[PDB]
Coordinates of C-alpha atoms and ligand atoms in Angstrom, one line a residue:
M1 CA -17.2 6.1 9.6
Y2 CA -18.3 5.2 6.1
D3 CA -21.7 6.6 7.0
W4 CA -20.3 9.9 8.3
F5 CA -18.3 9.6 5.0
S6 CA -21.4 9.3 2.8
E7 CA -22.9 12.2 4.8
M8 CA -20.0 14.5 4.3
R9 CA -19.7 13.6 0.7
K10 CA -23.3 15.0 0.3
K11 CA -22.8 18.1 2.4
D12 CA -19.1 18.8 2.8
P13 CA -16.7 16.8 0.5
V14 CA -14.0 19.3 1.3
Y15 CA -14.3 20.2 5.0
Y16 CA -12.2 22.0 7.6
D17 CA -12.1 20.6 11.2
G18 CA -10.0 23.3 12.8
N19 CA -6.5 21.9 12.2
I20 CA -6.6 20.0 8.9
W21 CA -8.4 20.1 5.7
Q22 CA -10.1 16.8 4.5
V23 CA -11.3 15.7 1.2
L24 CA -13.9 12.9 1.0
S25 CA -15.4 13.1 -2.4
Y26 CA -14.0 11.1 -5.4
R27 CA -13.9 14.1 -7.7
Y28 CA -11.9 16.2 -5.3
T29 CA -9.6 13.5 -3.7
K30 CA -8.7 12.6 -7.3
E31 CA -8.2 16.3 -8.1
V32 CA -5.8 16.7 -5.3
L33 CA -3.7 13.6 -6.2
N34 CA -3.3 14.6 -9.8
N35 CA -2.5 18.2 -9.3
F36 CA 0.9 17.8 -7.6
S37 CA 1.6 21.4 -8.5
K38 CA -0.8 22.9 -6.0
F39 CA -0.9 19.9 -3.7
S40 CA 2.7 18.9 -3.0
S41 CA 4.1 15.6 -1.6
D42 CA 7.3 17.5 -0.4
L43 CA 6.5 16.8 3.2
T44 CA 9.8 15.4 4.6
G45 CA 12.2 18.2 3.7
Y46 CA 13.7 16.4 0.7
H47 CA 13.5 19.3 -1.7
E48 CA 15.0 21.5 0.9
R49 CA 18.0 19.3 1.5
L50 CA 18.5 17.9 -2.0
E51 CA 21.6 20.1 -2.8
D52 CA 23.2 19.6 0.6
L53 CA 22.5 15.9 0.2
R54 CA 24.1 15.8 -3.2
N55 CA 26.8 18.1 -1.8
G56 CA 27.7 15.6 0.8
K57 CA 27.0 18.3 3.3
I58 CA 24.2 16.3 5.0
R59 CA 25.9 13.1 6.1
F60 CA 23.3 11.4 8.4
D61 CA 19.6 11.5 8.7
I62 CA 16.7 9.0 8.7
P63 CA 16.9 7.7 5.1
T64 CA 13.2 7.3 4.8
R65 CA 12.6 11.0 4.5
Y66 CA 14.2 10.9 1.0
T67 CA 12.4 8.7 -1.5
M68 CA 10.2 9.4 -4.5
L69 CA 7.2 9.2 -2.3
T70 CA 7.9 12.5 -0.4
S71 CA 9.0 14.5 -3.5
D72 CA 7.6 16.6 -6.3
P73 CA 8.7 16.7 -10.0
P74 CA 11.3 16.8 -11.5
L75 CA 13.1 15.1 -8.5
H76 CA 10.2 12.7 -8.2
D77 CA 10.3 11.8 -11.9
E78 CA 14.1 11.5 -12.0
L79 CA 14.0 9.1 -9.0
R80 CA 11.1 7.2 -10.4
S81 CA 12.4 6.7 -13.9
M82 CA 15.2 4.6 -12.3
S83 CA 12.8 1.8 -11.5
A84 CA 9.9 2.6 -13.9
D85 CA 9.9 -0.9 -15.5
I86 CA 10.7 -3.1 -12.4
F87 CA 7.2 -4.5 -12.5
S88 CA 6.8 -4.6 -16.2
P89 CA 4.3 -7.0 -17.9
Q90 CA 6.9 -9.4 -19.1
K91 CA 8.9 -9.2 -15.9
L92 CA 5.7 -10.1 -14.0
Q93 CA 4.8 -12.7 -16.6
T94 CA 8.1 -14.3 -15.6
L95 CA 7.8 -14.1 -11.8
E96 CA 4.4 -15.8 -12.1
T97 CA 5.8 -19.4 -11.7
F98 CA 7.9 -18.2 -8.7
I99 CA 4.9 -16.5 -7.1
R100 CA 2.5 -19.4 -7.6
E101 CA 5.1 -22.0 -6.5
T102 CA 5.8 -19.8 -3.4
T103 CA 2.1 -19.4 -2.5
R104 CA 1.5 -23.1 -3.0
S105 CA 4.3 -23.9 -0.6
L106 CA 3.0 -21.5 2.0
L107 CA -0.5 -23.0 1.7
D108 CA 1.1 -26.5 2.2
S109 CA 2.1 -25.3 5.7
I110 CA -1.5 -24.4 6.7
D111 CA -3.2 -26.7 9.3
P112 CA -6.8 -26.7 8.1
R113 CA -8.1 -27.8 11.5
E114 CA -7.3 -24.2 12.4
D115 CA -4.5 -21.8 11.5
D116 CA -3.8 -18.1 10.9
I117 CA -3.4 -17.2 7.2
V118 CA -2.0 -13.8 7.9
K119 CA 1.0 -15.4 9.5
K120 CA 1.2 -18.4 7.2
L121 CA 0.2 -16.9 3.8
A122 CA -0.5 -13.1 3.8
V123 CA 2.7 -11.9 5.5
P124 CA 5.4 -14.1 3.8
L125 CA 4.3 -14.1 0.1
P126 CA 5.0 -10.4 -0.5
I127 CA 8.2 -10.4 1.5
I128 CA 9.5 -13.5 -0.3
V129 CA 8.6 -12.1 -3.8
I130 CA 10.2 -8.7 -3.2
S131 CA 13.4 -10.2 -1.9
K132 CA 13.6 -12.3 -5.1
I133 CA 12.9 -9.2 -7.1
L134 CA 15.3 -6.9 -5.2
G135 CA 18.0 -9.6 -4.8
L136 CA 18.0 -9.3 -1.0
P137 CA 18.8 -12.5 0.8
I138 CA 15.4 -14.1 1.8
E139 CA 17.0 -15.9 4.8
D140 CA 16.2 -12.7 6.6
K141 CA 12.4 -13.1 6.6
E142 CA 11.9 -12.5 10.4
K143 CA 13.7 -9.2 10.1
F144 CA 12.2 -8.0 6.8
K145 CA 8.9 -8.7 8.6
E146 CA 9.8 -6.4 11.5
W147 CA 11.1 -3.6 9.3
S148 CA 8.0 -3.8 7.3
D149 CA 6.3 -1.8 10.2
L150 CA 8.3 1.2 9.2
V151 CA 6.3 1.8 6.0
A152 CA 5.6 5.5 5.5
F153 CA 1.8 5.2 5.7
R154 CA 2.0 4.3 9.4
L155 CA 2.1 7.2 11.9
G156 CA 3.6 7.6 15.3
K157 CA 2.5 6.6 18.8
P158 CA 4.0 7.0 22.3
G159 CA 7.0 5.1 23.6
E160 CA 8.2 3.6 20.3
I161 CA 11.4 5.6 19.9
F162 CA 13.7 2.9 21.3
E163 CA 12.0 0.1 19.2
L164 CA 12.1 2.1 16.0
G165 CA 15.7 3.1 16.5
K166 CA 16.6 -0.6 16.9
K167 CA 14.7 -1.6 13.7
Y168 CA 16.3 1.4 12.0
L169 CA 19.8 0.5 13.1
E170 CA 19.4 -3.1 11.8
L171 CA 17.5 -2.2 8.6
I172 CA 20.1 0.4 7.5
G173 CA 23.0 -2.0 8.3
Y174 CA 21.4 -4.7 6.2
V175 CA 20.9 -2.4 3.2
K176 CA 24.5 -1.1 3.6
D177 CA 25.6 -4.7 3.7
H178 CA 23.7 -5.7 0.6
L179 CA 23.8 -2.6 -1.7
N180 CA 26.1 -4.3 -4.2
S181 CA 24.8 -7.9 -4.3
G182 CA 21.4 -6.9 -5.6
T183 CA 19.6 -7.0 -9.0
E184 CA 19.8 -4.5 -11.8
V185 CA 17.1 -2.6 -10.0
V186 CA 19.3 -1.7 -7.0
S187 CA 22.6 -1.6 -8.9
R188 CA 21.1 1.2 -11.0
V189 CA 20.2 3.0 -7.7
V190 CA 23.5 2.3 -6.1
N191 CA 25.2 3.4 -9.3
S192 CA 23.4 6.8 -9.7
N193 CA 24.1 10.4 -8.7
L194 CA 21.9 10.0 -5.7
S195 CA 23.5 10.7 -2.3
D196 CA 24.4 7.8 -0.1
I197 CA 21.3 8.6 2.1
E198 CA 18.8 8.8 -0.9
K199 CA 20.1 5.4 -2.2
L200 CA 19.5 4.0 1.3
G201 CA 16.0 5.5 1.3
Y202 CA 15.3 4.5 -2.3
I203 CA 16.3 0.9 -1.4
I204 CA 14.3 0.7 1.8
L205 CA 11.3 2.1 0.0
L206 CA 11.4 -0.6 -2.7
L207 CA 11.9 -3.2 0.1
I208 CA 9.1 -2.4 2.5
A209 CA 6.6 -0.1 0.7
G210 CA 4.4 -3.0 -0.4
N211 CA 4.7 -5.6 2.3
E212 CA 2.0 -4.7 4.8
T213 CA -0.3 -3.2 2.1
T214 CA -0.2 -6.4 -0.1
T215 CA -0.6 -8.5 3.0
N216 CA -3.7 -6.5 3.9
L217 CA -5.0 -6.8 0.3
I218 CA -4.8 -10.6 0.7
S219 CA -6.3 -10.7 4.2
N220 CA -9.1 -8.2 3.4
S221 CA -9.9 -10.2 0.3
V222 CA -10.2 -13.5 2.2
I223 CA -12.4 -11.7 4.7
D224 CA -14.8 -10.1 2.2
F225 CA -15.1 -13.1 0.0
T226 CA -16.0 -15.2 3.1
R227 CA -18.3 -12.8 4.9
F228 CA -20.1 -12.1 1.6
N229 CA -20.1 -15.8 0.6
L230 CA -18.5 -15.1 -2.8
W231 CA -15.9 -17.9 -3.0
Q232 CA -18.3 -20.2 -5.1
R233 CA -19.2 -17.5 -7.6
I234 CA -15.6 -16.3 -8.0
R235 CA -14.4 -19.8 -8.8
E236 CA -17.4 -20.6 -11.0
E237 CA -17.5 -17.2 -12.9
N238 CA -13.7 -16.8 -12.5
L239 CA -14.1 -13.3 -11.0
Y240 CA -10.7 -13.3 -9.3
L241 CA -9.4 -10.2 -11.2
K242 CA -12.7 -8.3 -10.8
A243 CA -13.2 -9.4 -7.2
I244 CA -9.8 -8.3 -6.0
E245 CA -10.4 -4.9 -7.6
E246 CA -13.6 -4.7 -5.6
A247 CA -11.8 -5.7 -2.4
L248 CA -9.3 -2.9 -3.1
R249 CA -12.2 -0.5 -3.5
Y250 CA -14.4 -1.7 -0.7
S251 CA -11.6 -2.5 1.8
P252 CA -8.5 -0.3 0.9
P253 CA -5.2 -1.4 2.5
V254 CA -4.4 2.4 2.7
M255 CA -7.4 4.5 3.9
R256 CA -5.9 7.8 2.9
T257 CA -2.8 9.8 2.0
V258 CA -1.7 13.4 2.6
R259 CA -0.6 16.5 0.7
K260 CA 0.4 20.1 1.5
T261 CA -0.8 23.1 -0.5
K262 CA 2.2 24.7 -2.1
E263 CA 0.0 27.8 -2.3
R264 CA -3.5 29.2 -1.8
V265 CA -5.9 27.0 -3.7
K266 CA -9.6 26.7 -4.2
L267 CA -10.8 23.1 -4.1
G268 CA -14.5 22.9 -5.0
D269 CA -16.2 25.7 -3.0
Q270 CA -13.4 26.1 -0.5
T271 CA -10.2 28.1 -0.5
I272 CA -7.4 26.1 1.2
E273 CA -4.7 28.6 2.1
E274 CA -1.0 28.0 1.2
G275 CA 0.9 25.6 3.5
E276 CA -2.1 23.6 4.6
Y277 CA -2.0 19.8 5.0
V278 CA -4.8 18.1 3.1
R279 CA -6.1 14.7 4.2
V280 CA -7.2 12.7 1.1
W281 CA -9.6 10.0 2.2
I282 CA -9.1 7.3 -0.4
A283 CA -11.5 5.0 1.6
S284 CA -14.3 7.6 1.2
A285 CA -13.6 8.5 -2.5
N286 CA -14.0 4.7 -3.2
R287 CA -17.6 4.8 -1.8
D288 CA -18.6 7.9 -3.7
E289 CA -22.1 7.0 -5.0
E290 CA -21.9 9.4 -7.9
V291 CA -19.0 7.4 -9.3
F292 CA -19.7 4.0 -7.8
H293 CA -23.3 3.2 -8.0
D294 CA -24.4 1.2 -5.0
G295 CA -21.0 2.0 -3.5
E296 CA -22.1 0.7 -0.1
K297 CA -22.4 -2.7 -1.7
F298 CA -19.7 -5.3 -2.5
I299 CA -20.3 -6.2 -6.2
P300 CA -17.6 -8.9 -7.1
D301 CA -18.1 -8.3 -10.8
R302 CA -18.2 -4.5 -10.6
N303 CA -16.8 -3.1 -13.9
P304 CA -15.3 -0.8 -14.4
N305 CA -13.8 0.0 -11.0
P306 CA -11.8 3.3 -11.0
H307 CA -10.8 3.1 -7.3
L308 CA -8.0 5.2 -5.7
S309 CA -6.5 2.5 -3.5
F310 CA -3.2 2.8 -5.3
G311 CA -3.6 6.5 -5.6
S312 CA -3.8 8.4 -8.8
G313 CA -1.5 10.8 -10.7
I314 CA 2.3 10.8 -10.6
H315 CA 2.6 8.8 -7.4
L316 CA 0.2 6.1 -8.5
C317 CA 1.6 3.0 -6.7
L318 CA 4.7 1.7 -8.5
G319 CA 4.0 -1.8 -7.3
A320 CA 0.3 -1.9 -8.3
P321 CA 0.7 -4.5 -11.1
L322 CA 2.7 -6.7 -8.6
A323 CA 0.4 -6.3 -5.7
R324 CA -2.5 -7.3 -8.0
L325 CA -0.6 -10.3 -9.4
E326 CA 0.4 -11.6 -6.0
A327 CA -3.0 -11.2 -4.4
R328 CA -4.7 -12.9 -7.3
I329 CA -2.3 -15.9 -7.4
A330 CA -2.7 -16.2 -3.6
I331 CA -6.5 -15.9 -3.8
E332 CA -6.7 -18.5 -6.6
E333 CA -4.4 -21.1 -5.1
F334 CA -6.1 -20.6 -1.7
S335 CA -9.6 -21.0 -3.2
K336 CA -8.6 -24.2 -5.0
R337 CA -7.2 -25.8 -1.8
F338 CA -10.3 -25.5 0.3
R339 CA -13.9 -26.5 -0.3
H340 CA -15.2 -24.3 2.5
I341 CA -13.6 -21.6 4.7
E342 CA -14.7 -20.6 8.2
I343 CA -13.3 -17.6 9.9
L344 CA -12.7 -18.7 13.4
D345 CA -10.9 -15.7 14.8
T346 CA -9.5 -12.3 13.8
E347 CA -7.3 -9.5 15.1
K348 CA -7.2 -6.1 13.5
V349 CA -4.1 -3.9 13.3
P350 CA -4.7 -0.6 15.0
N351 CA -4.1 2.3 12.6
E352 CA -6.2 5.0 10.9
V353 CA -4.3 4.7 7.6
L354 CA -3.2 1.0 7.4
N355 CA -6.3 -1.3 7.2
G356 CA -6.0 -5.0 7.5
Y357 CA -5.6 -7.8 10.0
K358 CA -2.9 -8.7 12.5
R359 CA -4.6 -12.1 12.8
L360 CA -6.9 -14.2 10.7
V361 CA -7.7 -17.6 12.2
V362 CA -9.7 -20.0 10.0
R363 CA -10.8 -23.5 9.5
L364 CA -10.7 -25.0 6.1
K365 CA -12.4 -28.1 4.6
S366 CA -10.2 -29.5 1.8
Ligands
HEM1 C1 -2.1 -3.7 -2.7 C2 -1.3 -3.0 -1.9 C3 -0.8 -1.7 -2.1 C4 -1.5 -0.6 -1.9 C5 -3.1 -0.5 -1.6 C6 -0.5 0.5 -2.1 C7 -0.9 1.9 -2.0 C8 -0.1 2.9 -2.4 C9 -0.6 4.3 -2.5 C10 -1.9 4.8 -1.9 C11 0.4 5.0 -3.0 C12 0.4 6.5 -3.4 C13 0.8 7.3 -2.1 C14 0.7 8.8 -2.4 O1 0.2 9.2 -3.5 O2 1.1 9.6 -1.5 C15 1.6 4.1 -3.2 C16 2.8 4.5 -3.7 C17 3.9 3.7 -3.9 N1 3.9 2.3 -3.8 FE1 2.3 1.2 -3.1 N2 0.7 0.1 -2.4 C18 0.6 -1.3 -2.5 C19 1.6 -2.2 -2.9 C20 2.8 -1.8 -3.4 C21 3.9 -2.8 -3.7 C22 3.8 -4.3 -3.9 C23 5.0 -2.1 -3.9 C24 6.2 -2.6 -4.3 C25 7.5 -2.3 -3.7 C26 4.7 -0.6 -3.8 C27 5.5 0.5 -4.1 C28 5.2 1.8 -4.1 C29 6.1 2.9 -4.4 C30 7.6 2.8 -4.7 C31 5.3 4.1 -4.3 C32 5.9 5.5 -4.5 C33 5.9 5.9 -6.0 C34 5.8 7.4 -6.2 O3 5.9 8.2 -5.3 O4 5.7 7.7 -7.4 N3 3.3 -0.5 -3.4 N4 1.3 2.8 -2.9

């Protein structure tokens, strides 16, 4: 749909399809994201139940509807300030040895003759690192893996209620069971004026928000570097940092995000009435030719690279520095372990928002 995308960007970067409004241009998708005032993220009834939550009135509810993600300032900023430095430069500088050692061990388990790197490398790494960071017992990998499906970006589909409930019952219990044996990060949350529910949500957010996305970043990277035969250049020119930024732009783990107009607003040449949901196509903004010359091309050394794969504005991905650091250590250690990589088989996860692979079978020559 990147062609329809290029088409619409030219003719209708802010279009209405009957039900929802969609924004495909870079200038306008960025505008939406940065103007939280007109385009609110208060889409799960958090702002409406804050008081009753803090009142103790609301006692039970799906905890995931109350996290910084689905909230506007000040609430958002108050919640966010509690973990603002969790992925700070020095902190990441220090996890480096852990991340690299961890990726190297994961690589050590790969059978070059033929293996799936999604299963052996892409999935575990982020989970293992976030547990370390959050202080949540890693001996619960198989479960963290399952609950990672609950990430907000993913939307619903028929007959999933019983499955989701089950994952939800276990996930919550796990959190409840570990709320006090975690790092400063969670303690601060646990020891705040947040309701019991919001703390639950806050904790689940930090736990699962970057698993599937970071995994996808790693998978999509391996794919693009391979299909575009850039492994040699990347190693030679050391374009790891730049190439992962291009992978993010070209192959975004999250294709889009959503907002709701908190009022009647004119975006470009259109007037989006109050209360309208607005689809922000991150994938399309990333291809915007006005901003990204030769956007249809994968330029491994593209610089600069102002993509919106982590968003923009106040909700700009909290884990961005971490996702970047993890994918880059994974891509480097992977690239130094094989002479040549051959994609033998793939399986793509089915979702219009989440974009990556369920399976990535390859053959490596050490
Ligand atoms: C490379 C993979 C990743 C991608 C592409 C991604 C993408 C995004 C995007 C698009 C947003 C903004 C959503 C919006 O504006 O509605 C976001 C928010 C967020 N991300 Fe990620 N993410 C990734 C990795 C991570 C990691 C590793 C973590 C770590 C736990 C994480 C934590 C968060 C949090 C907490 C927010 C909400 C912050 C706020 O609302 O201010 N993300 N992410």
